[PDB]
């Protein structure tokens, strides 16, 4: 049942990196763009 | 992230930024 | 058998977290670069 | 990530960045 | 007892991809107030 | 990174940057 709940937690673990990463993508892409567009 | 991090290790012995940090 | 299996998966979720922090890494140095050559 | 994501759900219950999402 | 090994392999695996991507945020949050500031 | 990740491949089958990558 822990190897179970272990898992079930490292999943919210990983969906909240995903999230962080696509916010770090979204922002390191726009601020590629500001430089190009300067 | 540190809620989560906490249960885990826990277990295995026996949105926005502060947000995130926090779960 | 549903345990292994959710691991197996969970280390691929890892290696593509992997790979975008790594893209991310490159592409925040290239920018940090490109403002010090500025 | 999606894909890996439905997959586990379902176990625990019972490159580009497009493909990468899809992943 | 390979599950639990995994899982605990996997942990620090997890808190390796947290650190990259706190540092990632950092340093595009810098990068953007710089541009702000600019 | 690199060595939890072959670590975890022989389980399942049986700080700077270049260190993040080695572990």
Same mark, same amino acid.
């Given at each position: 049942?822990?190897?179970?709940?272990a898992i079930e937690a *490292? /999943?919210?673990l990983? *969906?909240?990196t995903v999230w962080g990463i696509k916010q770090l /993508?979204? +922002?390191i892409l726009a601020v590629? +763009?500001?430089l190009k567009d300067q | 992230x540190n809620n989560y991090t906490?249960?885990?290790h826990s277990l295995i =012995? =026996?949105?926005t930024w502060m =947000?995130?940090?926090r779960e």
């Open positions: 049942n822990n190897l179970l709940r *490292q /999943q919210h990983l *969906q909240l /993508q979204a +922002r590629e +763009r500001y | 906490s249960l885990i =012995e =026996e949105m =947000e995130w940090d």
